[PDB]
Amino acid sequence: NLCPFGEVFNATRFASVYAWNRKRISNCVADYSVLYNSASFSTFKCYGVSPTKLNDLCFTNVYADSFVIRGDEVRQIAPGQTGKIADYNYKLPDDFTGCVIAWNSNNLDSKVGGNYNYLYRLFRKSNLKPFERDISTEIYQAGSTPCNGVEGFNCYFPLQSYGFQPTNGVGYQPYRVVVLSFELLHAPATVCGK
Amino acid sequence: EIVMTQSPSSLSASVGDRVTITCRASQGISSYLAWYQQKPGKAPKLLIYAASTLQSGVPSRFSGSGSGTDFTLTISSLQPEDFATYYCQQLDSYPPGYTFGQGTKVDIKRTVAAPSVFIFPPSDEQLKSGTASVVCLLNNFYPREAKVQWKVDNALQSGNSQESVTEQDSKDSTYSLSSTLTLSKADYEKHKVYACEVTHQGLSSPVTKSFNRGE
Amino acid sequence: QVQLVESGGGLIQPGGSLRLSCAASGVTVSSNYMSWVRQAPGKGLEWVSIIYSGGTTYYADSVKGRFTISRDSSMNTLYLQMNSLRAEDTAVYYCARDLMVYGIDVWGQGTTVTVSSASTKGPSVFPLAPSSKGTAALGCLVKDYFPEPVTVSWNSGALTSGVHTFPAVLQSSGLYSLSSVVTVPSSSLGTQTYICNVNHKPSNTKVDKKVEPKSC
Ligand SMILES: *[C@@H]1O[C@H](CO[C@@H]2O[C@@H](C)[C@@H](O)[C@@H](O)[C@@H]2O)[C@@H](O[C@@H]2O[C@H](CO)[C@@H](O)[C@H](O)[C@H]2NC(C)=O)[C@H](O)[C@H]1NC(C)=O
Ligand SMILES: [Cl-]
Ligand SMILES: [Cl-]
Ligand SMILES: [Cl-]
Ligand SMILES: [Cl-]
Ligand SMILES: [Cl-]
């Protein structure tokens, strides 16, 4: 039967990038024509696979990761990128085999008072390994004396909110991102194209 | 690119006044804004972050407000230690860098005072060296805004002068300004009438001081 | 004690190299966004570079390939390595702790960098004579010196009232100029000598200039 790409690209709520969502897709036929023939995406970059020439390929697993970030941050969802998102929120590997898909969702994810539901990690001691997901809320120790779960000076809650307002410039407007990873193991393949 | 437009460039305020400084983003930055204070020779001091939150240790008379495009800093009751320069900062911008407003100098208010204008010819000692410096002095005036125009044989001169202003005087709150017109001795000897024309709020009409080369 | 202390600034010819230090206490440099921000004379704050706690670095376009930010965790110190220096690199250089949306909250006191081909030179001191035409103005033109600063006094400190020593300007030649003026009663111009005392330690120059009414 058919792969539930609808449940991902068409989800009513998206995850905050620090707590990005992962959908494991298996045992289905994937119609990628639905995706690449869409006029509705503003970013659609594939690394190591040709999009049109995906339908005659089988993989053992496909992963669909989705979240929301700033327009200015979409460029960080790529191999070998740096920045608050790539370093501390969502990291692709240098040898990435997949596709990054993004579209402007200012009409959805911003409120007039500002939508504070979407969060990103702002403070972290070291960079994420690829496909790592840090959901910790430990108070961040920016100085010499420790924090003990108490916020304050040099003692910072690690997450921050975007607060998307519809009057934002594109760089501050929310974009929904879907990262498709194409995994091929020494196990029976379960995802092929039309 | 997002541009920050801050206004006014300068305002004058007595102690106890309510001061208001404005910053306009060319496109929506939501609440990604901060305000700073800076005094001559010192580093910036953070006052407000996230458009409207008061930094720890900053007196409660400082307050920030606004979200989206229009932002204001507000000093509800100006204190003597608040005469400084203030400016806004767009937070977390792209491409990397810190976009700051142009700045607002807040000086001490006093009654208007017209400058005393004096013109000084180049000395004979300097002329022997090859260069003629002509100096125009604007002494003890208020407010700071003042226009000095050099005229050489009634030709308005621009491009060959530099100006220097003192800081507001700690006793009478005035400014003094100098303007230096530099010429080669040869050029200087090609002309007779040297004048600086000063316009200022304290002067009903422009004041001119002049000399004739060699008199 | 939460502070950032800079050092390493100085005078250097174009094309030279210079290494700035920023010693922190309270703040841990390797746990923070640390920036270098500079301010040229009379101009605004210009961001130079930033290093993330995770190691990521960025640079202003104007310094790419010439500056390198770094840090020594054991020394709790931030560094800026500046090669191929140019005149327009001249500025006060601050190190700062960036909290992004929480603003830049800790700044150092700044260290001064001056990049110039100018040769150290003591100033010429020319008179600004009182005009023949109740109170008269006179002064001294302190022209063509390098580097800053000069100090000026009048009558060895006995004349301080009404003295205005202006901030120096940088000329197209790369040397500084400056004037010092004073207003005095017209009635004193024949009975009171006015000498300006000019001191410029970099060149070991002390000059006293008598300023007189000019004799037609
Ligand atoms: C995501 O949804 C859009 C919209 O689908 C419509 O609303 C749904 C709730 C459902 O009721 C659909 O039947 C509706 O058509 C899909 O875009 C449409 O796709 C169909 C074919 O799949 C096409 O005939 C329509 O013209 C498309 N309409 C628009 C406005 O584009 C889209 O395909 C879905 N994406 C995925 C991956 O499932
Ligand atoms: Cl200050
Ligand atoms: Cl930056
Ligand atoms: Cl060197
Ligand atoms: Cl990097
Ligand atoms: Cl004085």
Numbering used by the authors:
A (entry chain E): 334 to 527
B (entry chain L): 1 to 215
C (entry chain H): 1 to 133, 138 to 220
Can I see the authors' text?
S from both SARS-CoV-2 and SARS-CoV-1 uses angiotensin-converting enzyme 2 (ACE2) as the cell surface receptor (Hoffmann et al., 2020, Li, 2015), ACE2 is expressed in a number of tissues, including epithelial cells of the upper and lower respiratory tracts. S consists of two subunits, S1 that mediates receptor binding and S2 responsible for viral and host cell membrane fusion (Walls et al., 2020; Wrapp et al., 2020). The S1 fragment, at the membrane distal tip of S, includes an N-terminal domain (NTD) and receptor binding domain (RBD). Although both regions are immunogenic, the RBD contains the interacting surface for ACE2 binding (Lan et al., 2020).
We determined structures for three members of the group, 150, 158, and 269 (the others are 175 and 222) and found that they bind almost identically at the back of the neck with similar footprints of ~800 Å2. The flat binding site of the RBD and the approach angle of the Fabs limit their H3 length (11 residues) and the number of contacts H3 makes with the RBD, which is compensated for by the interactions from H1, H2, and all CDRs of the light chain. The H3 length matches that reported as optimal for this V-region (Yuan et al., 2020b), and the H3 sequence of mAb 150 is strongly similar to that of CC1.12 (Yuan et al., 2020b). We note strong LC interactions with residue N501 of the RBD, which is mutated in recent variants (B.1.1.7, B.1.351, P.1).
